Design a protein around this ligand. Structure first.
Ligand code: FE2
Length: 369
């Protein structure tokens, strides 16, 4: 390798060595645990030279008095370099602990980050410790750090290489075997660099739209924690994103179009089949959108193929309007009552027993891998 790449491998091999011996049953905030971790790190000769590791080490040393990873997050948020290293404690990323990555940025069109700014970093992982190999760890959020905090400057990271992989492994196959021929002309058989860019558009518009509307997630997180409502919210921001891709004609047309089709294929196909024995919240949301589209003339089933209707962009805007109409009630009714209204919308387009994978996708999951 190059000289840097060899040194990074030495840094990461040290991380992987400490990490695998850590008592993971312990409370990772316990001072004896952290002191012992600090001592292994202080005797870790390539790791302890890295600026991010020195920030982490000082944060950890002071953690009892100051339970913030203040220097670690300042390093990452200012992007002093493209190294991300910390001690993570995330319920839904259980394999993350003492973990280290380097990333490469992805170029995005200026009007995208200009008109639709958030603190979102779509990046590719270029090297990492074992925790970041977990296929589950497709993003990284400020509160996943040991201090559990999210603050207004914090950058959110999405590992686009992992989304491209999911597209290559599941979505492509599904487009061919599930959609009508000709459904997704700009993204069908598209090159990975083009999927990559579509996916970076998706995450950027996704996070932007979370913060938009009458019930934006920062403020209304708890209103939207129930599985159907968590899923309906993700649907709201993805459809909003799709519609920006169709309606904002100042965006480059091929890229916006490619992003649009990527988002719709991912939502209609890959997210719709996820689920151990039963659908997850993303799956239920895809079920919801699918049923809603069937029943309102956005898509039709014939031949065991989804056919995308000419007026799908109109049915999408109708869909988003029904959510916004319910969410606008927040300004005059109780949260409990607006939550009941959101729930009533989802129940009209899903099947609950937990939720059941709808029969069309039960057969696709059966038919395909
Ligand atoms: Fe989201």
């Amino acid at each position: 390798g190059s000289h840097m790449s060899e040194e990074i491998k030495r840094v990461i091999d040290e991380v992987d060595g400490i990490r695998k011996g850590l008592d993971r049953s312990a409370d990772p905030r316990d001072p004896e645990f952290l002191d012992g971790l600090l001592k292994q790190m202080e005797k870790s000769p390539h790791l302890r030279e890295q600026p991010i590791a020195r920030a982490l080490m000082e944060d950890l040393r002071g953690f009892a008095e100051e339970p913030r990873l203040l220097r670690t997050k300042a390093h990452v948020n200012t992007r002093r370099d493209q190294h991300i290293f910390s001690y993570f404690d995330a319920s839904y990323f259980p394999r993350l602990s003492l973990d280290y990555l380097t990333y490469e940025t992805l170029p995005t069109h200026p009007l995208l980050a200009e008109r639709y700014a958030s603190n979102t970093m779509p990046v590719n992982i270029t090297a990492c410790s074992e925790g970041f190999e977990s296929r589950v760890v497709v993003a990284l959020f400020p509160e996943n750090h040991l201090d559990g905090r999210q603050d207004p400057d914090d950058l959110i990271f999405y590992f686009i290489n992992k989304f491209v992989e999911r597209h290559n492994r599941i979505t492509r196959k599904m487009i061919d075997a599930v959609m009508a021929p000709g459904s997704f002309p700009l993204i069908q058989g598209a090159d990975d660099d083009l999927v990559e860019s579509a996916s970076a558009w998706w995450v950027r518009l996704h996070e932007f739209h979370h913060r938009q509307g009458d019930m934006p997630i920062p403020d209304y997180l708890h209103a939207k924690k129930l599985k159907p409502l968590a899923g309906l919210e993700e649907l709201r921001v993805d459809v909003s994103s799709m519609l920006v891709c169709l309606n904002d004609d100042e965006l480059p047309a091929d890229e916006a179009r490619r992003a649009y089709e990527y988002m719709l294929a991912e939502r209609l196909l890959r997210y719709a089949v996820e689920g151990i024995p039963r659908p997850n919240y993303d799956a239920v949301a895809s079920q919801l959108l699918f049923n809603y589209l069937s029943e309102n003339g956005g898509i039709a089933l014939r031949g065991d193929r989804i056919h995308l209707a000419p007026e799908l962009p109109a049915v999408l805007a109708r869909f988003l309007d029904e959510i916004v109409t319910v969410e606008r009630r927040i300004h005059s009714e109780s949260v409990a009552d607006v939550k009941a209204g959101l729930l009533a919308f989802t129940n009209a387009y899903t099947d609950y027993d937990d939720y059941r994978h709808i029969p069309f996708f039960a057969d696709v999951k059966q038919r395909l891998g």
